[PDB]
Amino acid sequence: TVAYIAIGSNLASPLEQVNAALKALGDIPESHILTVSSFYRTPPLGPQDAPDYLNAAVALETSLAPEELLNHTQRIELQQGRVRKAERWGPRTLDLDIMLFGNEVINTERLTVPHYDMKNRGFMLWPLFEIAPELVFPDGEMLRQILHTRAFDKLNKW
Ligand SMILES: Nc1ncnc2c1ncn2[C@@H]1O[C@H](COP(=O)(O)CP(=O)(O)OP(=O)(O)O)[C@@H](O)[C@H]1O
Ligand SMILES: Nc1nc2nccnc2c(=O)[nH]1
Ligand SMILES: [Cl-]
Ligand SMILES: [Mg+2]
Ligand SMILES: [Mg+2]
């Protein structure tokens, strides 16, 4: 199965967290990375007093079940999603979301795939389009179609 994972980090300087996360994704059992999008810089959807997000997309070939993959992404968030500050550990700044899991539709207590809001988010769609321009969603919607319809602005690279 090709799973598409969105990476987001809103650390002030996120490159080292993002790289640590990418390495960890490549260590997930029964899986391997196929391709990684560019890193993109995207404003937060609120006050400008917050750090930019770094957003990227990863194609991961996996034989894991969707919930097993989620266990691993959540583990990675726990293990390398927080950065040590001067006095204490900081809060979670790394987000690993499963955008698509092959052509599967998943609606459980733990999982909603396709990701419930990705079609509203240029910061999810654009990196995905870079690595999968011909992508078709389970219901037959095309990624190209969603971007064409909504006209979301292209993202600046990090
Ligand atoms: N496709 C998916 N990928 C990752 N987590 C998912 C998911 N579908 C549902 N979830 C659930 O989402 C819950 C909350 O995860 P969080 O990472 O805190 C939300 P977030 O990513 O910060 O916001 P967002 O979902 O608006 O992007 C998890 O406990 C997980 O079970
Ligand atoms: N720019 C941006 N904003 C966000 N806001 C909430 C959750 N994820 C994100 C994300 O990944 N990028
Ligand atoms: Cl449904
Ligand atoms: Mg998210
Ligand atoms: Mg999340």
PDB file of C-alpha atoms and ligand atoms in Angstrom:
ATOM      1  CA  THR A   1       0.000   0.000   0.000  1.00  0.00           C
ATOM      2  CA  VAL A   2       1.151   3.527  -0.750  1.00  0.00           C
ATOM      3  CA  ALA A   3       0.353   5.699   2.254  1.00  0.00           C
ATOM      4  CA  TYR A   4       0.691   9.458   1.962  1.00  0.00           C
ATOM      5  CA  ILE A   5       1.720  11.162   5.188  1.00  0.00           C
ATOM      6  CA  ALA A   6       1.640  14.891   5.868  1.00  0.00           C
ATOM      7  CA  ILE A   7       4.398  16.289   8.050  1.00  0.00           C
ATOM      8  CA  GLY A   8       3.981  19.587   9.839  1.00  0.00           C
ATOM      9  CA  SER A   9       6.261  21.320  12.321  1.00  0.00           C
ATOM     10  CA  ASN A  10       5.852  24.791  13.784  1.00  0.00           C
ATOM     11  CA  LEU A  11       9.106  24.972  15.700  1.00  0.00           C
ATOM     12  CA  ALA A  12      10.947  28.264  15.157  1.00  0.00           C
ATOM     13  CA  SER A  13      13.743  26.275  13.527  1.00  0.00           C
ATOM     14  CA  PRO A  14      12.050  23.047  12.395  1.00  0.00           C
ATOM     15  CA  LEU A  15      14.532  21.465   9.971  1.00  0.00           C
ATOM     16  CA  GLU A  16      16.189  19.156  12.502  1.00  0.00           C
ATOM     17  CA  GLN A  17      12.895  17.932  13.919  1.00  0.00           C
ATOM     18  CA  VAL A  18      11.554  17.316  10.423  1.00  0.00           C
ATOM     19  CA  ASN A  19      14.686  15.383   9.461  1.00  0.00           C
ATOM     20  CA  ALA A  20      14.528  13.341  12.651  1.00  0.00           C
ATOM     21  CA  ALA A  21      10.892  12.538  11.822  1.00  0.00           C
ATOM     22  CA  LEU A  22      11.755  11.567   8.246  1.00  0.00           C
ATOM     23  CA  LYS A  23      14.470   9.216   9.423  1.00  0.00           C
ATOM     24  CA  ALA A  24      12.051   7.662  11.924  1.00  0.00           C
ATOM     25  CA  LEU A  25       9.426   7.190   9.197  1.00  0.00           C
ATOM     26  CA  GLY A  26      12.054   5.299   7.201  1.00  0.00           C
ATOM     27  CA  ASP A  27      12.593   2.982  10.171  1.00  0.00           C
ATOM     28  CA  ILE A  28       8.943   1.908  10.449  1.00  0.00           C
ATOM     29  CA  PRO A  29       8.706  -1.903  10.124  1.00  0.00           C
ATOM     30  CA  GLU A  30       7.311  -3.467   6.935  1.00  0.00           C
ATOM     31  CA  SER A  31       7.621  -0.108   5.196  1.00  0.00           C
ATOM     32  CA  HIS A  32       9.926   2.142   3.219  1.00  0.00           C
ATOM     33  CA  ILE A  33       9.908   5.693   1.914  1.00  0.00           C
ATOM     34  CA  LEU A  34       9.243   6.055  -1.822  1.00  0.00           C
ATOM     35  CA  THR A  35       9.570   9.820  -2.162  1.00  0.00           C
ATOM     36  CA  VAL A  36       9.570  13.038  -0.083  1.00  0.00           C
ATOM     37  CA  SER A  37       8.228  16.391  -1.256  1.00  0.00           C
ATOM     38  CA  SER A  38      10.045  19.673  -0.949  1.00  0.00           C
ATOM     39  CA  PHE A  39       9.760  21.501   2.352  1.00  0.00           C
ATOM     40  CA  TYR A  40       7.278  24.346   2.227  1.00  0.00           C
ATOM     41  CA  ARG A  41       6.786  27.364   4.449  1.00  0.00           C
ATOM     42  CA  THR A  42       3.188  28.094   5.344  1.00  0.00           C
ATOM     43  CA  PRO A  43       1.657  30.752   7.606  1.00  0.00           C
ATOM     44  CA  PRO A  44      -0.426  29.618  10.598  1.00  0.00           C
ATOM     45  CA  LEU A  45      -4.187  30.056  10.231  1.00  0.00           C
ATOM     46  CA  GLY A  46      -4.440  32.750  12.901  1.00  0.00           C
ATOM     47  CA  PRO A  47      -2.425  35.504  14.636  1.00  0.00           C
ATOM     48  CA  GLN A  48       0.975  36.297  13.107  1.00  0.00           C
ATOM     49  CA  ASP A  49       2.626  35.932  16.517  1.00  0.00           C
ATOM     50  CA  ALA A  50       3.279  32.242  15.853  1.00  0.00           C
ATOM     51  CA  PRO A  51       6.074  30.477  13.931  1.00  0.00           C
ATOM     52  CA  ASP A  52       5.618  29.506  10.281  1.00  0.00           C
ATOM     53  CA  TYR A  53       4.853  25.828   9.692  1.00  0.00           C
ATOM     54  CA  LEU A  54       7.135  23.624   7.647  1.00  0.00           C
ATOM     55  CA  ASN A  55       4.908  21.259   5.652  1.00  0.00           C
ATOM     56  CA  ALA A  56       5.862  18.264   3.502  1.00  0.00           C
ATOM     57  CA  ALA A  57       4.375  15.082   2.093  1.00  0.00           C
ATOM     58  CA  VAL A  58       5.854  11.580   2.188  1.00  0.00           C
ATOM     59  CA  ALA A  59       4.923   8.545   0.108  1.00  0.00           C
ATOM     60  CA  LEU A  60       5.474   5.448   2.248  1.00  0.00           C
ATOM     61  CA  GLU A  61       5.153   1.946   0.848  1.00  0.00           C
ATOM     62  CA  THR A  62       3.814  -0.265   3.641  1.00  0.00           C
ATOM     63  CA  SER A  63       2.351  -3.690   4.322  1.00  0.00           C
ATOM     64  CA  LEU A  64       1.068  -2.543   7.728  1.00  0.00           C
ATOM     65  CA  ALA A  65      -2.631  -2.174   8.452  1.00  0.00           C
ATOM     66  CA  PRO A  66      -3.760   1.467   8.616  1.00  0.00           C
ATOM     67  CA  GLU A  67      -4.137   1.394  12.427  1.00  0.00           C
ATOM     68  CA  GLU A  68      -0.688  -0.172  12.785  1.00  0.00           C
ATOM     69  CA  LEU A  69       0.773   2.648  10.733  1.00  0.00           C
ATOM     70  CA  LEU A  70      -1.065   5.137  12.979  1.00  0.00           C
ATOM     71  CA  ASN A  71       0.484   3.451  16.028  1.00  0.00           C
ATOM     72  CA  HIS A  72       3.907   4.118  14.527  1.00  0.00           C
ATOM     73  CA  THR A  73       3.259   7.715  13.515  1.00  0.00           C
ATOM     74  CA  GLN A  74       1.847   8.432  16.980  1.00  0.00           C
ATOM     75  CA  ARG A  75       4.883   6.794  18.577  1.00  0.00           C
ATOM     76  CA  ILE A  76       7.149   9.011  16.482  1.00  0.00           C
ATOM     77  CA  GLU A  77       5.206  12.067  17.631  1.00  0.00           C
ATOM     78  CA  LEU A  78       5.727  10.980  21.265  1.00  0.00           C
ATOM     79  CA  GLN A  79       9.406  10.151  20.787  1.00  0.00           C
ATOM     80  CA  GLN A  80      10.615  13.036  18.661  1.00  0.00           C
ATOM     81  CA  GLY A  81       7.676  15.435  18.497  1.00  0.00           C
ATOM     82  CA  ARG A  82       8.819  17.549  21.430  1.00  0.00           C
ATOM     83  CA  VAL A  83      11.989  19.563  21.706  1.00  0.00           C
ATOM     84  CA  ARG A  84      13.861  20.129  24.934  1.00  0.00           C
ATOM     85  CA  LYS A  85      13.777  23.721  26.061  1.00  0.00           C
ATOM     86  CA  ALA A  86      16.085  25.290  28.629  1.00  0.00           C
ATOM     87  CA  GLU A  87      14.222  24.187  31.748  1.00  0.00           C
ATOM     88  CA  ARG A  88      11.658  21.723  30.449  1.00  0.00           C
ATOM     89  CA  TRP A  89      10.474  19.716  27.472  1.00  0.00           C
ATOM     90  CA  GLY A  90       8.354  21.730  25.056  1.00  0.00           C
ATOM     91  CA  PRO A  91       4.904  20.719  23.788  1.00  0.00           C
ATOM     92  CA  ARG A  92       4.242  18.681  20.668  1.00  0.00           C
ATOM     93  CA  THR A  93       5.341  20.602  17.559  1.00  0.00           C
ATOM     94  CA  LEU A  94       5.420  17.657  15.119  1.00  0.00           C
ATOM     95  CA  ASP A  95       2.235  16.484  13.406  1.00  0.00           C
ATOM     96  CA  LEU A  96       2.137  13.289  11.306  1.00  0.00           C
ATOM     97  CA  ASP A  97      -1.245  12.899   9.596  1.00  0.00           C
ATOM     98  CA  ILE A  98      -2.250  10.073   7.289  1.00  0.00           C
ATOM     99  CA  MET A  99      -3.722  11.785   4.223  1.00  0.00           C
ATOM    100  CA  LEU A 100      -4.419   8.711   2.116  1.00  0.00           C
ATOM    101  CA  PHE A 101      -3.925   4.976   2.585  1.00  0.00           C
ATOM    102  CA  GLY A 102      -3.886   3.430  -0.851  1.00  0.00           C
ATOM    103  CA  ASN A 103      -7.415   3.750  -2.199  1.00  0.00           C
ATOM    104  CA  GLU A 104      -8.960   2.784   1.133  1.00  0.00           C
ATOM    105  CA  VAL A 105     -11.791   4.598   2.879  1.00  0.00           C
ATOM    106  CA  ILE A 106     -11.414   4.402   6.670  1.00  0.00           C
ATOM    107  CA  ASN A 107     -13.923   5.679   9.224  1.00  0.00           C
ATOM    108  CA  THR A 108     -13.131   4.439  12.717  1.00  0.00           C
ATOM    109  CA  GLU A 109     -12.852   5.991  16.152  1.00  0.00           C
ATOM    110  CA  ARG A 110      -9.123   6.441  15.535  1.00  0.00           C
ATOM    111  CA  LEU A 111      -8.921   7.047  11.802  1.00  0.00           C
ATOM    112  CA  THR A 112     -10.584   9.119   9.156  1.00  0.00           C
ATOM    113  CA  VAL A 113      -8.983   8.571   5.744  1.00  0.00           C
ATOM    114  CA  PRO A 114      -8.897  10.495   3.499  1.00  0.00           C
ATOM    115  CA  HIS A 115      -7.877  13.111   6.064  1.00  0.00           C
ATOM    116  CA  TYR A 116     -11.041  14.980   7.026  1.00  0.00           C
ATOM    117  CA  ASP A 117      -9.893  18.476   6.022  1.00  0.00           C
ATOM    118  CA  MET A 118      -7.114  18.023   3.470  1.00  0.00           C
ATOM    119  CA  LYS A 119      -9.286  19.298   0.594  1.00  0.00           C
ATOM    120  CA  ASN A 120      -9.447  22.674   2.375  1.00  0.00           C
ATOM    121  CA  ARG A 121      -5.695  22.946   2.936  1.00  0.00           C
ATOM    122  CA  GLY A 122      -3.260  24.113   0.289  1.00  0.00           C
ATOM    123  CA  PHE A 123      -0.476  23.216   2.730  1.00  0.00           C
ATOM    124  CA  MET A 124      -1.546  19.574   2.447  1.00  0.00           C
ATOM    125  CA  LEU A 125      -2.580  19.470  -1.213  1.00  0.00           C
ATOM    126  CA  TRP A 126       0.362  21.256  -2.816  1.00  0.00           C
ATOM    127  CA  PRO A 127       3.152  19.061  -1.396  1.00  0.00           C
ATOM    128  CA  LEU A 128       1.051  16.011  -2.253  1.00  0.00           C
ATOM    129  CA  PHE A 129       0.569  17.267  -5.830  1.00  0.00           C
ATOM    130  CA  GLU A 130       4.323  17.675  -6.199  1.00  0.00           C
ATOM    131  CA  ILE A 131       4.860  13.970  -5.527  1.00  0.00           C
ATOM    132  CA  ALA A 132       1.590  12.553  -6.900  1.00  0.00           C
ATOM    133  CA  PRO A 133       0.169  14.846  -9.589  1.00  0.00           C
ATOM    134  CA  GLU A 134      -2.079  12.103 -11.035  1.00  0.00           C
ATOM    135  CA  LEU A 135      -3.486  11.035  -7.664  1.00  0.00           C
ATOM    136  CA  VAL A 136      -7.085   9.860  -7.522  1.00  0.00           C
ATOM    137  CA  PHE A 137      -9.061   9.769  -4.270  1.00  0.00           C
ATOM    138  CA  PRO A 138     -11.083   6.668  -3.313  1.00  0.00           C
ATOM    139  CA  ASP A 139     -14.349   8.260  -4.485  1.00  0.00           C
ATOM    140  CA  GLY A 140     -12.951   9.207  -7.880  1.00  0.00           C
ATOM    141  CA  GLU A 141     -12.130  12.855  -7.166  1.00  0.00           C
ATOM    142  CA  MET A 142      -8.712  13.821  -8.592  1.00  0.00           C
ATOM    143  CA  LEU A 143      -6.097  15.836  -6.704  1.00  0.00           C
ATOM    144  CA  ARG A 144      -5.561  17.946  -9.824  1.00  0.00           C
ATOM    145  CA  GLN A 145      -9.319  18.656  -9.886  1.00  0.00           C
ATOM    146  CA  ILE A 146      -9.407  19.861  -6.277  1.00  0.00           C
ATOM    147  CA  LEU A 147      -6.496  22.273  -6.830  1.00  0.00           C
ATOM    148  CA  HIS A 148      -7.997  23.471 -10.127  1.00  0.00           C
ATOM    149  CA  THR A 149     -11.403  24.107  -8.519  1.00  0.00           C
ATOM    150  CA  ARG A 150     -10.166  25.889  -5.349  1.00  0.00           C
ATOM    151  CA  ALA A 151      -7.227  27.808  -6.863  1.00  0.00           C
ATOM    152  CA  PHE A 152      -5.193  27.689  -3.628  1.00  0.00           C
ATOM    153  CA  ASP A 153      -2.012  29.738  -3.943  1.00  0.00           C
ATOM    154  CA  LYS A 154       1.218  27.865  -4.534  1.00  0.00           C
ATOM    155  CA  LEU A 155       3.449  27.598  -1.481  1.00  0.00           C
ATOM    156  CA  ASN A 156       6.879  29.080  -0.945  1.00  0.00           C
ATOM    157  CA  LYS A 157       9.619  26.525  -0.391  1.00  0.00           C
ATOM    158  CA  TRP A 158      11.371  26.641   2.958  1.00  0.00           C
TER     159      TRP A 158
HETATM  160  N1  LIG B   1      -5.878  10.482   9.047  1.00  0.00           N
HETATM  161  C1  LIG B   1      -5.477  10.634  10.319  1.00  0.00           C
HETATM  162  N2  LIG B   1      -4.169  10.825  10.598  1.00  0.00           N
HETATM  163  C2  LIG B   1      -3.811  11.000  11.876  1.00  0.00           C
HETATM  164  N3  LIG B   1      -4.567  11.030  12.976  1.00  0.00           N
HETATM  165  C3  LIG B   1      -5.864  10.856  12.675  1.00  0.00           C
HETATM  166  C4  LIG B   1      -6.376  10.653  11.402  1.00  0.00           C
HETATM  167  N4  LIG B   1      -7.762  10.493  11.437  1.00  0.00           N
HETATM  168  C5  LIG B   1      -8.080  10.614  12.709  1.00  0.00           C
HETATM  169  N5  LIG B   1      -6.984  10.820  13.502  1.00  0.00           N
HETATM  170  C6  LIG B   1      -7.042  11.048  14.933  1.00  0.00           C
HETATM  171  O1  LIG B   1      -6.771  12.428  15.185  1.00  0.00           O
HETATM  172  C7  LIG B   1      -6.597  12.476  16.611  1.00  0.00           C
HETATM  173  C8  LIG B   1      -6.021  13.809  16.998  1.00  0.00           C
HETATM  174  O2  LIG B   1      -4.724  13.949  16.366  1.00  0.00           O
HETATM  175  P1  LIG B   1      -4.064  15.399  16.384  1.00  0.00           P
HETATM  176  O3  LIG B   1      -2.754  15.221  15.692  1.00  0.00           O
HETATM  177  O4  LIG B   1      -4.036  15.946  17.775  1.00  0.00           O
HETATM  178  C9  LIG B   1      -5.123  16.422  15.365  1.00  0.00           C
HETATM  179  P2  LIG B   1      -4.174  17.599  14.415  1.00  0.00           P
HETATM  180  O5  LIG B   1      -3.409  16.864  13.340  1.00  0.00           O
HETATM  181  O6  LIG B   1      -3.410  18.497  15.334  1.00  0.00           O
HETATM  182  O7  LIG B   1      -5.284  18.456  13.670  1.00  0.00           O
HETATM  183  P3  LIG B   1      -5.974  18.134  12.213  1.00  0.00           P
HETATM  184  O8  LIG B   1      -6.568  16.750  12.321  1.00  0.00           O
HETATM  185  O9  LIG B   1      -6.965  19.262  12.064  1.00  0.00           O
HETATM  186  O10 LIG B   1      -4.908  18.212  11.161  1.00  0.00           O
HETATM  187  C10 LIG B   1      -5.779  11.228  16.933  1.00  0.00           C
HETATM  188  O11 LIG B   1      -5.992  10.763  18.233  1.00  0.00           O
HETATM  189  C11 LIG B   1      -6.106  10.247  15.824  1.00  0.00           C
HETATM  190  O12 LIG B   1      -6.811   9.110  16.351  1.00  0.00           O
HETATM  191  N1  LIG B   2       0.309  26.093   7.993  1.00  0.00           N
HETATM  192  C1  LIG B   2      -0.185  25.057   8.744  1.00  0.00           C
HETATM  193  N2  LIG B   2      -1.100  25.313   9.633  1.00  0.00           N
HETATM  194  C2  LIG B   2      -1.592  24.247  10.339  1.00  0.00           C
HETATM  195  N3  LIG B   2      -2.543  24.520  11.264  1.00  0.00           N
HETATM  196  C3  LIG B   2      -3.024  23.501  11.952  1.00  0.00           C
HETATM  197  C4  LIG B   2      -2.585  22.177  11.757  1.00  0.00           C
HETATM  198  N4  LIG B   2      -1.656  21.898  10.859  1.00  0.00           N
HETATM  199  C5  LIG B   2      -1.154  22.917  10.153  1.00  0.00           C
HETATM  200  C6  LIG B   2      -0.115  22.620   9.158  1.00  0.00           C
HETATM  201  O1  LIG B   2       0.376  21.532   8.918  1.00  0.00           O
HETATM  202  N5  LIG B   2       0.307  23.792   8.493  1.00  0.00           N
HETATM  203 CL    CL B   3     -18.729   8.387   6.192  1.00  0.00          CL
HETATM  204 MG    MG B   4      -2.895  17.795  11.479  1.00  0.00          MG
HETATM  205 MG    MG B   5      -2.356  15.072  13.637  1.00  0.00          MG
END
